Amino acid sequence: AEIYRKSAAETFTQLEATEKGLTTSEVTKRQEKYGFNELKNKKKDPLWKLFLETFKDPMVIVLVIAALVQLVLGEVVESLIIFLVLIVNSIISVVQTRKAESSLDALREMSAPVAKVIRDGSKQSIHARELVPGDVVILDAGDFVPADGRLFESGSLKIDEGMLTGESEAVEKYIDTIPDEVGLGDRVNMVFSGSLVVYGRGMFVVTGTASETEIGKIAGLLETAEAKQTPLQRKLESFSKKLGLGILALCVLIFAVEAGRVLLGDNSADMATAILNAFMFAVAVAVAAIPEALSSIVTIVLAVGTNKMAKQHAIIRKLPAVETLGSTSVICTDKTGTLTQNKMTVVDYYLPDGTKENFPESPENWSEGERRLIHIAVLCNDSNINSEGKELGDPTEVALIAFSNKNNQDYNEIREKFIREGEIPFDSDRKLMSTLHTFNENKAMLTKGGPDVMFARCSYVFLDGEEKPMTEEILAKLKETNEEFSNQALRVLAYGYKRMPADTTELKLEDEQDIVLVGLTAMIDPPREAVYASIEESKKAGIRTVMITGDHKTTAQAIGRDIGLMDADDIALTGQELDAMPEEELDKKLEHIAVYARVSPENKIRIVKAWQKKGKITAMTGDGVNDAPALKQADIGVAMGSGTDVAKDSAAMILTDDNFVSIVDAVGVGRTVFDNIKKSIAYLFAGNLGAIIAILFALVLDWINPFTALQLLFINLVNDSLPAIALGMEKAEPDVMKRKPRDINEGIFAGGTMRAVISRGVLIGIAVIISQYIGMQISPEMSVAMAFTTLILARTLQTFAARSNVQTAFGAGFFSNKYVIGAVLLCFVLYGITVLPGAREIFSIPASFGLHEWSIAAGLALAAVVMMEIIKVVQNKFFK
Ligand SMILES: [Ca+2]
Ligand SMILES: [Mg+2]
């Protein structure tokens, strides 16, 4: 910016320096007033018990204190079960919040940038945190540029600038003083901090050592510190406490028979302490109706979803948001590095004949000119693939070796067969590089370069025999094949094989005369193969996708056509067009275009804001600083595993393997988490209402109260904590995909839940009431005890089809979930122990043998379940 307009000498006039040396007379002083290089002193678990952290949501811990004031004066009377159920619920929550695995990789991402620099006229390797403005620092293909600056020494230099602004192909570097560019960085020819150099030699004056750097300026947009809530943070419990509190208001009128409420004589003049019993039954009813475990359910169902992503090399942070990827509808992407592999690979070879479209593997089934094209493509390289595959050197030569890997013929054998006989390394001004080798013991000249440069020098072409191209019908074919490749946006390279006569001396600068052309190699950064299926899965899932990248438009059109995103009927859209019209018309054209090219990091904010503004939950995936603002403005951010540490820290999802199908897997676990969180609470809410109507029906006819305070705590202990948690582990529901993303305008009150729990609660109420009326034969220990066991049996047995709203409890239901089987078994045996313990016998004193009517009561409980079963048939029938 601007620095480019002035020369390399005028730029340092403002910034005190001599471009060389910079003794400590200023370095030891002005660096402090200038500030330090690093921005990392910005933005960067206690777990003493961490159960207090869970003790901050609306609780019953204050309510349970009132239990002691009534439980005192009796050694066996005291009931601490309500106190101890909640602490156990927190214990499982905190241990499942730990997940036996922390948000690791926190120690993995270490920058530790080092720069080889000249201080006080001496050669050293000073830490990048100590670079001073105006400093003279050399560059090589073993590190990256540590600070923004202006180049002084220029030759055979290009850098991988695409990490911060998004050109897949590297940009060349040379000294220039063109003032009339924009300043994005695609042509400024200025070193931008953090960018990896390709190869060559670099030596530049360090202009900016501060947050003023372009990478630091990107963090200036990150500096806004945008903190928001989670889309599921809306709390229906706030309405539930209103309903629960209202029941308590009616509950003090439930015990209207008391002398203080009956307004009648014939009873004790004093109100007879039954208020405490009424108050005891009131809070016990209230704590039964209160979905206390619902808050604990949220943590457990989310933690396992994060744990499942940990086995897919998709470790994530910010646990409370994993269903967001399940609820998204539009996905923002980022061409460079995010879809492409950030590794240039040759995908199409063309020869003037070019008979074969796929390069044959075994050389025995090759073509005639294919050998020469490979030989020049393996010998005219400056890279090397070591025993691990380090790909040291320029990426284009790595693609040539990658081509040599396709045929299984390693480049090392040919490089060993003909080591070298002298060569002219590539220089920026003359885009050519020629290497001399031996063919059938005869010295041969091999030169490679740009397409049009060779088309000016393609004085011969050989595929079966060397001959003049007559500058027509073959040179035109080179023009049309170069043109279509440019239409495909491929950095096509042309290769030539010249017959050096007999003994060859050193190759002079002008030896590429009468160079016989071999063929053309077309290379382009290809998208990862994982994104092919990831789109067909997303396309059928009703999740729209848009690609945004600051690369050139021609590349943006080529990709997407290979992915299916491009409409193939309209031109792509560029960032400058957004400014041409108001943002409301941008919303109009937002849905009729899916590719955006040449967009600033701020241009990503406006589009991602518009997607959020239209009510669709958006997600941003990318690598590099050119994506950090969009990640935060998106309520869910996905950082590529190979991106800059700025991107990984800013976003909320990391894919260490750099896989892309994990996003679909993260979508699926997010959808299942929402269904589990929408069904686990549906089960407890439905059964809790069944208890309410049981009390309510006894009110209208003033039946004996059908429940006892000690058992309300017990049913809650066994049908509000364990079964709810187990249902949160519900198997992968049938076709969790193929469903359009859940509408964010609808809460848990959607038809799928309310139109089911309402019927579910009524069926419970009918069952328990029948038990009371059947139990009306004897009021004590028969009318009140018989109803308790039916509710416990009915409540814990209807979980069979509360496991899934699609799969039948028996037709498609099995012991698929060991958690629900264990929870069902544990609550069953625990109740079975406590019905015939021989020590307590809340049931009638005759227990475990006077079961002749316990069968019908148990059968009555199953009758509701089988009547609940036909509701499943109703779900699967046409009557819906
Ligand atoms: Ca409860
Ligand atoms: Mg990128």
Short mmCIF file of N, CA, C and O in Angstrom, two decimals, residues 127-237:
data_model
loop_
_atom_site.label_atom_id
_atom_site.label_comp_id
_atom_site.label_asym_id
_atom_site.label_seq_id
_atom_site.Cartn_x
_atom_site.Cartn_y
_atom_site.Cartn_z
N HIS A 127 15.65 -13.97 16.48
CA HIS A 127 14.24 -14.29 16.59
C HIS A 127 13.40 -13.25 15.87
O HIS A 127 13.73 -12.06 15.85
N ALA A 128 12.30 -13.70 15.27
CA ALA A 128 11.45 -12.81 14.50
C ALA A 128 10.80 -11.74 15.38
O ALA A 128 10.34 -10.72 14.85
N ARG A 129 10.75 -11.95 16.69
CA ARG A 129 10.20 -10.95 17.59
C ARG A 129 11.08 -9.71 17.71
O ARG A 129 10.62 -8.69 18.24
N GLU A 130 12.32 -9.77 17.22
CA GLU A 130 13.29 -8.69 17.40
C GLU A 130 13.56 -7.91 16.12
O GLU A 130 14.44 -7.04 16.12
N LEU A 131 12.83 -8.19 15.04
CA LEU A 131 13.06 -7.45 13.81
C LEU A 131 12.70 -5.98 14.03
O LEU A 131 11.72 -5.66 14.70
N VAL A 132 13.51 -5.10 13.46
CA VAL A 132 13.32 -3.66 13.63
C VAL A 132 12.89 -3.04 12.30
O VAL A 132 13.21 -3.59 11.24
N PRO A 133 12.16 -1.93 12.31
CA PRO A 133 11.84 -1.27 11.05
C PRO A 133 13.11 -0.88 10.31
O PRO A 133 14.09 -0.42 10.91
N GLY A 134 13.09 -1.07 9.00
CA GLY A 134 14.23 -0.78 8.16
C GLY A 134 15.28 -1.87 8.13
O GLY A 134 16.29 -1.72 7.43
N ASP A 135 15.08 -2.97 8.86
CA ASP A 135 16.10 -3.99 8.99
C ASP A 135 16.35 -4.68 7.65
O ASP A 135 15.47 -4.77 6.79
N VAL A 136 17.58 -5.17 7.49
CA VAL A 136 17.99 -5.91 6.30
C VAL A 136 18.02 -7.39 6.65
O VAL A 136 18.80 -7.82 7.51
N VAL A 137 17.17 -8.17 5.98
CA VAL A 137 17.01 -9.59 6.27
C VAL A 137 17.04 -10.36 4.96
O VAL A 137 16.38 -9.96 3.99
N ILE A 138 17.79 -11.46 4.93
CA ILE A 138 17.87 -12.30 3.75
C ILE A 138 16.78 -13.36 3.82
O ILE A 138 16.24 -13.66 4.89
N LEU A 139 16.44 -13.93 2.67
CA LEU A 139 15.37 -14.91 2.57
C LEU A 139 15.85 -16.12 1.78
O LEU A 139 16.69 -16.01 0.89
N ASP A 140 15.29 -17.28 2.12
CA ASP A 140 15.62 -18.53 1.45
C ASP A 140 14.45 -19.49 1.61
O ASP A 140 13.56 -19.29 2.43
N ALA A 141 14.46 -20.55 0.80
CA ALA A 141 13.38 -21.53 0.81
C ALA A 141 13.54 -22.51 1.96
O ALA A 141 13.53 -23.73 1.76
N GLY A 142 13.69 -21.99 3.17
CA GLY A 142 13.76 -22.81 4.37
C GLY A 142 12.98 -22.20 5.51
O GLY A 142 12.94 -22.75 6.62
N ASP A 143 12.36 -21.06 5.25
CA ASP A 143 11.56 -20.34 6.23
C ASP A 143 10.57 -19.48 5.46
O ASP A 143 10.39 -19.64 4.25
N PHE A 144 9.92 -18.54 6.15
CA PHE A 144 8.98 -17.64 5.53
C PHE A 144 9.32 -16.20 5.91
O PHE A 144 10.08 -15.95 6.85
N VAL A 145 8.74 -15.26 5.17
CA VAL A 145 8.99 -13.85 5.47
C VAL A 145 8.44 -13.54 6.86
O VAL A 145 7.28 -13.88 7.16
N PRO A 146 9.22 -12.90 7.74
CA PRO A 146 8.74 -12.66 9.11
C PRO A 146 8.06 -11.31 9.33
O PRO A 146 7.40 -11.15 10.36
N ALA A 147 8.20 -10.36 8.41
CA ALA A 147 7.61 -9.04 8.60
C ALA A 147 7.39 -8.40 7.24
O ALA A 147 8.14 -8.64 6.30
N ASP A 148 6.35 -7.58 7.16
CA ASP A 148 6.05 -6.87 5.92
C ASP A 148 7.16 -5.88 5.60
O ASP A 148 7.72 -5.24 6.48
N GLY A 149 7.48 -5.77 4.31
CA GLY A 149 8.54 -4.88 3.90
C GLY A 149 8.52 -4.65 2.41
O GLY A 149 7.59 -5.05 1.71
N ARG A 150 9.58 -4.00 1.93
CA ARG A 150 9.79 -3.75 0.51
C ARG A 150 11.09 -4.39 0.07
O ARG A 150 12.11 -4.30 0.75
N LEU A 151 11.04 -5.05 -1.09
CA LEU A 151 12.20 -5.78 -1.58
C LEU A 151 13.27 -4.82 -2.10
O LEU A 151 12.97 -3.73 -2.59
N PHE A 152 14.52 -5.24 -1.94
CA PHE A 152 15.66 -4.55 -2.55
C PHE A 152 16.36 -5.43 -3.57
O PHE A 152 16.52 -5.02 -4.73
N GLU A 153 16.79 -6.63 -3.18
CA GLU A 153 17.41 -7.57 -4.10
C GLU A 153 16.33 -8.44 -4.73
O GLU A 153 15.53 -9.07 -4.02
N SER A 154 16.31 -8.49 -6.06
CA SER A 154 15.25 -9.15 -6.80
C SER A 154 15.85 -10.03 -7.88
O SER A 154 16.55 -9.54 -8.77
N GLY A 155 15.58 -11.33 -7.80
CA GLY A 155 15.93 -12.24 -8.87
C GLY A 155 15.47 -13.66 -8.60
O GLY A 155 15.73 -14.21 -7.52
N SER A 156 14.79 -14.26 -9.57
CA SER A 156 14.29 -15.63 -9.46
C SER A 156 13.56 -15.83 -8.13
O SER A 156 13.84 -16.75 -7.37
N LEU A 157 12.61 -14.94 -7.86
CA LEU A 157 11.93 -14.90 -6.57
C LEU A 157 10.42 -14.95 -6.76
O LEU A 157 9.86 -14.14 -7.51
N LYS A 158 9.77 -15.89 -6.07
CA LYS A 158 8.32 -15.93 -5.97
C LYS A 158 7.96 -16.47 -4.59
O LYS A 158 8.72 -17.22 -3.98
N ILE A 159 6.78 -16.07 -4.11
CA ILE A 159 6.35 -16.39 -2.75
C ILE A 159 4.95 -16.99 -2.79
O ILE A 159 4.15 -16.69 -3.69
N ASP A 160 4.65 -17.82 -1.80
CA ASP A 160 3.32 -18.42 -1.67
C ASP A 160 2.40 -17.46 -0.92
O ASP A 160 1.99 -17.68 0.22
N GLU A 161 2.08 -16.36 -1.60
CA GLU A 161 1.27 -15.30 -1.01
C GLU A 161 -0.18 -15.71 -0.82
O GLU A 161 -0.92 -15.00 -0.13
N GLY A 162 -0.61 -16.83 -1.40
CA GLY A 162 -2.01 -17.19 -1.37
C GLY A 162 -2.55 -17.50 0.01
O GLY A 162 -3.78 -17.60 0.16
N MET A 163 -1.69 -17.65 1.01
CA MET A 163 -2.17 -17.99 2.34
C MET A 163 -2.94 -16.83 2.96
O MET A 163 -3.92 -17.05 3.68
N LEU A 164 -2.51 -15.60 2.70
CA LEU A 164 -3.11 -14.42 3.32
C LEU A 164 -4.10 -13.69 2.42
O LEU A 164 -4.94 -12.94 2.95
N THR A 165 -4.03 -13.86 1.10
CA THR A 165 -4.97 -13.19 0.20
C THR A 165 -5.60 -14.09 -0.85
O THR A 165 -6.67 -13.72 -1.36
N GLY A 166 -5.01 -15.23 -1.20
CA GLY A 166 -5.78 -16.28 -1.83
C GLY A 166 -5.48 -16.61 -3.27
O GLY A 166 -6.36 -17.11 -3.98
N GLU A 167 -4.27 -16.34 -3.75
CA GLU A 167 -3.84 -16.81 -5.06
C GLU A 167 -3.25 -18.21 -4.90
O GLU A 167 -2.21 -18.38 -4.25
N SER A 168 -3.91 -19.20 -5.50
CA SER A 168 -3.39 -20.57 -5.46
C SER A 168 -1.99 -20.64 -6.05
O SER A 168 -1.08 -21.23 -5.45
N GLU A 169 -1.79 -20.05 -7.22
CA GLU A 169 -0.46 -19.94 -7.79
C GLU A 169 0.34 -18.86 -7.07
O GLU A 169 -0.21 -17.83 -6.66
N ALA A 170 1.63 -19.10 -6.90
CA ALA A 170 2.50 -18.13 -6.27
C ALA A 170 2.67 -16.91 -7.17
O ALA A 170 2.53 -16.98 -8.39
N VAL A 171 2.98 -15.78 -6.55
CA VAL A 171 3.19 -14.52 -7.25
C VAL A 171 4.68 -14.25 -7.34
O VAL A 171 5.43 -14.56 -6.41
N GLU A 172 5.11 -13.68 -8.46
CA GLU A 172 6.53 -13.43 -8.66
C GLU A 172 6.94 -12.14 -7.96
O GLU A 172 6.12 -11.26 -7.69
N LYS A 173 8.24 -12.04 -7.67
CA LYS A 173 8.79 -10.91 -6.95
C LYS A 173 9.93 -10.30 -7.75
O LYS A 173 10.85 -11.02 -8.17
N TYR A 174 9.87 -8.99 -7.96
CA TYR A 174 10.97 -8.27 -8.58
C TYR A 174 10.85 -6.80 -8.22
O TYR A 174 9.78 -6.33 -7.81
N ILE A 175 11.96 -6.08 -8.38
CA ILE A 175 11.97 -4.66 -8.05
C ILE A 175 11.17 -3.90 -9.11
O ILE A 175 11.40 -4.06 -10.31
N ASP A 176 10.24 -3.08 -8.65
CA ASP A 176 9.42 -2.28 -9.55
C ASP A 176 8.90 -1.07 -8.79
O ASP A 176 8.89 -1.05 -7.56
N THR A 177 8.49 -0.06 -9.55
CA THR A 177 7.96 1.18 -8.99
C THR A 177 6.69 1.59 -9.73
O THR A 177 6.52 2.74 -10.14
N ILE A 178 5.77 0.64 -9.91
CA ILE A 178 4.48 0.93 -10.52
C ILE A 178 3.55 1.44 -9.42
O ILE A 178 3.31 0.72 -8.44
N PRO A 179 3.03 2.66 -9.51
CA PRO A 179 2.20 3.18 -8.41
C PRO A 179 0.71 2.90 -8.54
O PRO A 179 -0.02 3.00 -7.56
N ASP A 180 0.25 2.54 -9.74
CA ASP A 180 -1.17 2.61 -10.07
C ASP A 180 -1.86 1.26 -9.95
O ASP A 180 -2.74 0.93 -10.75
N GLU A 181 -1.48 0.45 -8.97
CA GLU A 181 -2.20 -0.77 -8.64
C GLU A 181 -3.18 -0.50 -7.51
O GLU A 181 -3.27 0.62 -6.98
N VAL A 182 -3.92 -1.53 -7.11
CA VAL A 182 -4.93 -1.38 -6.07
C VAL A 182 -4.29 -1.41 -4.69
O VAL A 182 -4.35 -0.44 -3.93
N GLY A 183 -3.65 -2.53 -4.36
CA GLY A 183 -3.00 -2.68 -3.07
C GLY A 183 -3.43 -3.94 -2.34
O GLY A 183 -3.04 -4.16 -1.19
N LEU A 184 -4.23 -4.78 -3.01
CA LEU A 184 -4.63 -6.04 -2.39
C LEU A 184 -3.43 -6.94 -2.15
O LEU A 184 -3.33 -7.59 -1.11
N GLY A 185 -2.50 -6.98 -3.11
CA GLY A 185 -1.31 -7.79 -2.97
C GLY A 185 -1.05 -8.73 -4.13
O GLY A 185 -0.03 -9.42 -4.15
N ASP A 186 -1.97 -8.77 -5.09
CA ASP A 186 -1.79 -9.67 -6.22
C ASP A 186 -0.69 -9.22 -7.17
O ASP A 186 -0.15 -10.05 -7.91
N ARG A 187 -0.35 -7.93 -7.18
CA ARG A 187 0.68 -7.42 -8.07
C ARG A 187 1.58 -6.39 -7.40
O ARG A 187 2.44 -5.81 -8.08
N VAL A 188 1.43 -6.14 -6.10
CA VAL A 188 2.20 -5.09 -5.45
C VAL A 188 3.68 -5.42 -5.39
O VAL A 188 4.51 -4.51 -5.24
N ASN A 189 4.06 -6.69 -5.49
CA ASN A 189 5.46 -7.10 -5.42
C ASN A 189 6.11 -6.64 -4.12
O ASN A 189 7.27 -6.21 -4.10
N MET A 190 5.37 -6.73 -3.02
CA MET A 190 5.86 -6.40 -1.69
C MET A 190 5.69 -7.61 -0.79
O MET A 190 4.65 -8.28 -0.82
N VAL A 191 6.71 -7.89 0.01
CA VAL A 191 6.67 -9.04 0.91
C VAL A 191 5.65 -8.78 2.01
O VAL A 191 5.67 -7.73 2.67
N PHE A 192 4.73 -9.73 2.20
CA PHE A 192 3.70 -9.65 3.23
C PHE A 192 3.99 -10.67 4.31
O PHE A 192 4.20 -11.85 4.02
N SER A 193 3.98 -10.22 5.57
CA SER A 193 4.48 -11.03 6.66
C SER A 193 3.71 -12.34 6.77
O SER A 193 2.49 -12.37 6.60
N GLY A 194 4.43 -13.42 7.05
CA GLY A 194 3.83 -14.73 7.22
C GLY A 194 3.77 -15.59 5.97
O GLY A 194 3.52 -16.79 6.08
N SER A 195 3.98 -15.01 4.79
CA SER A 195 3.88 -15.76 3.55
C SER A 195 5.13 -16.60 3.33
O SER A 195 6.25 -16.14 3.55
N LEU A 196 4.92 -17.85 2.92
CA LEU A 196 6.03 -18.75 2.64
C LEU A 196 6.65 -18.41 1.29
O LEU A 196 5.93 -18.21 0.31
N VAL A 197 7.97 -18.36 1.24
CA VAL A 197 8.68 -18.15 -0.02
C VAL A 197 8.77 -19.47 -0.77
O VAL A 197 8.83 -20.55 -0.17
N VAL A 198 8.77 -19.39 -2.09
CA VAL A 198 8.83 -20.60 -2.91
C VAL A 198 10.27 -21.09 -3.02
O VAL A 198 10.61 -22.18 -2.53
N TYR A 199 11.14 -20.30 -3.64
CA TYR A 199 12.56 -20.60 -3.70
C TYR A 199 13.24 -19.43 -4.40
O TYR A 199 12.59 -18.57 -5.01
N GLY A 200 14.58 -19.41 -4.31
CA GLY A 200 15.39 -18.37 -4.90
C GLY A 200 16.22 -17.66 -3.85
O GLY A 200 16.80 -18.30 -2.96
N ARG A 201 16.27 -16.34 -3.94
CA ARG A 201 17.03 -15.52 -3.01
C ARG A 201 16.28 -14.22 -2.77
O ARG A 201 15.90 -13.54 -3.72
N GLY A 202 16.07 -13.89 -1.51
CA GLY A 202 15.37 -12.67 -1.15
C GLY A 202 16.13 -11.87 -0.11
O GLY A 202 16.75 -12.43 0.79
N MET A 203 16.07 -10.55 -0.25
CA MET A 203 16.71 -9.64 0.70
C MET A 203 15.95 -8.32 0.62
O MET A 203 16.05 -7.62 -0.39
N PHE A 204 15.21 -7.99 1.67
CA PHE A 204 14.30 -6.86 1.66
C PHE A 204 14.49 -6.03 2.92
O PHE A 204 14.99 -6.51 3.94
N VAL A 205 14.09 -4.77 2.83
CA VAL A 205 14.09 -3.86 3.97
C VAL A 205 12.76 -3.99 4.69
O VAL A 205 11.70 -3.98 4.06
N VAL A 206 12.82 -4.10 6.02
CA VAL A 206 11.64 -4.37 6.82
C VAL A 206 10.95 -3.04 7.10
O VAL A 206 11.45 -2.22 7.88
N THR A 207 9.80 -2.82 6.47
CA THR A 207 9.09 -1.55 6.63
C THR A 207 8.23 -1.55 7.89
O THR A 207 8.40 -0.70 8.77
N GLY A 208 7.30 -2.50 7.99
CA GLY A 208 6.37 -2.52 9.10
C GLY A 208 6.67 -3.61 10.11
O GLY A 208 6.65 -4.80 9.77
N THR A 209 6.95 -3.21 11.35
CA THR A 209 7.11 -4.14 12.47
C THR A 209 6.12 -3.73 13.55
O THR A 209 6.48 -3.06 14.52
N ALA A 210 4.87 -4.16 13.40
CA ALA A 210 3.81 -3.79 14.33
C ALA A 210 2.55 -4.55 13.93
O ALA A 210 2.58 -5.41 13.04
N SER A 211 1.45 -4.24 14.60
CA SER A 211 0.14 -4.65 14.13
C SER A 211 -0.23 -3.98 12.82
O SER A 211 -1.19 -4.42 12.17
N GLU A 212 0.50 -2.95 12.41
CA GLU A 212 0.24 -2.27 11.15
C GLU A 212 0.52 -3.16 9.94
O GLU A 212 0.12 -2.80 8.83
N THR A 213 1.18 -4.29 10.14
CA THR A 213 1.40 -5.23 9.05
C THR A 213 0.07 -5.73 8.52
O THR A 213 -0.96 -5.69 9.20
N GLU A 214 0.08 -6.22 7.28
CA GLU A 214 -1.16 -6.67 6.66
C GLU A 214 -1.77 -7.84 7.42
O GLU A 214 -2.99 -7.92 7.57
N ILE A 215 -0.93 -8.75 7.92
CA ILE A 215 -1.44 -9.83 8.75
C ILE A 215 -1.90 -9.29 10.10
O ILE A 215 -2.91 -9.75 10.65
N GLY A 216 -1.18 -8.32 10.65
CA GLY A 216 -1.63 -7.67 11.86
C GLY A 216 -2.89 -6.85 11.64
O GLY A 216 -3.77 -6.81 12.51
N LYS A 217 -2.99 -6.19 10.49
CA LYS A 217 -4.20 -5.44 10.18
C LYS A 217 -5.41 -6.35 10.05
O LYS A 217 -6.53 -5.94 10.36
N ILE A 218 -5.20 -7.59 9.60
CA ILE A 218 -6.30 -8.55 9.57
C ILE A 218 -6.80 -8.83 10.98
O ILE A 218 -8.01 -8.90 11.22
N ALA A 219 -5.88 -8.99 11.93
CA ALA A 219 -6.28 -9.15 13.32
C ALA A 219 -6.98 -7.91 13.85
O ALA A 219 -7.70 -7.99 14.85
N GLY A 220 -6.79 -6.76 13.20
CA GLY A 220 -7.55 -5.58 13.57
C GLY A 220 -9.04 -5.79 13.38
O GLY A 220 -9.85 -5.31 14.17
N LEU A 221 -9.42 -6.50 12.32
CA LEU A 221 -10.81 -6.91 12.18
C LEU A 221 -11.16 -7.98 13.20
O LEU A 221 -12.30 -8.03 13.69
N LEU A 222 -10.21 -8.86 13.53
CA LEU A 222 -10.42 -9.83 14.59
C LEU A 222 -10.45 -9.17 15.96
O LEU A 222 -11.00 -9.75 16.90
N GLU A 223 -9.88 -7.97 16.08
CA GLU A 223 -9.80 -7.27 17.36
C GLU A 223 -11.16 -6.84 17.88
O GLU A 223 -11.27 -6.49 19.06
N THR A 224 -12.19 -6.87 17.03
CA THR A 224 -13.52 -6.44 17.47
C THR A 224 -14.02 -7.27 18.64
O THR A 224 -14.85 -6.79 19.43
N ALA A 225 -13.53 -8.50 18.78
CA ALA A 225 -13.90 -9.36 19.90
C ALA A 225 -15.41 -9.55 19.96
O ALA A 225 -16.09 -9.16 20.91
N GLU A 226 -15.93 -10.16 18.89
CA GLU A 226 -17.36 -10.41 18.78
C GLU A 226 -17.71 -11.66 19.59
O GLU A 226 -17.24 -12.76 19.28
N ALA A 227 -18.53 -11.48 20.62
CA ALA A 227 -18.99 -12.58 21.46
C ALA A 227 -20.51 -12.59 21.47
O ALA A 227 -21.14 -11.58 21.82
N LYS A 228 -21.10 -13.72 21.09
CA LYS A 228 -22.55 -13.86 21.01
C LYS A 228 -23.01 -15.10 21.76
O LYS A 228 -22.22 -15.74 22.46
N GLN A 229 -24.28 -15.45 21.61
CA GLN A 229 -24.86 -16.61 22.26
C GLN A 229 -25.04 -17.74 21.24
O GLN A 229 -24.66 -17.62 20.07
N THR A 230 -25.63 -18.84 21.69
CA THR A 230 -25.86 -20.03 20.90
C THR A 230 -27.32 -20.08 20.46
O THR A 230 -28.21 -19.72 21.24
N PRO A 231 -27.61 -20.51 19.23
CA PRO A 231 -29.01 -20.46 18.76
C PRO A 231 -29.99 -21.21 19.63
O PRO A 231 -31.18 -20.85 19.65
N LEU A 232 -29.56 -22.23 20.37
CA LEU A 232 -30.45 -22.94 21.28
C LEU A 232 -30.51 -22.32 22.67
O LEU A 232 -31.10 -22.92 23.57
N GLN A 233 -29.91 -21.14 22.86
CA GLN A 233 -29.92 -20.53 24.18
C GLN A 233 -31.31 -20.07 24.62
O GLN A 233 -31.49 -19.77 25.80
N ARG A 234 -32.28 -20.01 23.71
CA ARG A 234 -33.64 -19.74 24.14
C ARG A 234 -34.10 -20.84 25.08
O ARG A 234 -33.93 -22.03 24.81
N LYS A 235 -34.68 -20.43 26.21
CA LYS A 235 -34.97 -21.32 27.32
C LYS A 235 -36.48 -21.40 27.51
O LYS A 235 -37.10 -20.46 28.03
N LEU A 236 -37.08 -22.51 27.09
CA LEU A 236 -38.49 -22.74 27.40
C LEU A 236 -38.71 -23.00 28.89
O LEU A 236 -39.84 -22.89 29.36
N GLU A 237 -37.65 -23.33 29.63
CA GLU A 237 -37.81 -23.55 31.06
C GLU A 237 -38.27 -22.28 31.77
O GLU A 237 -39.00 -22.36 32.76
#
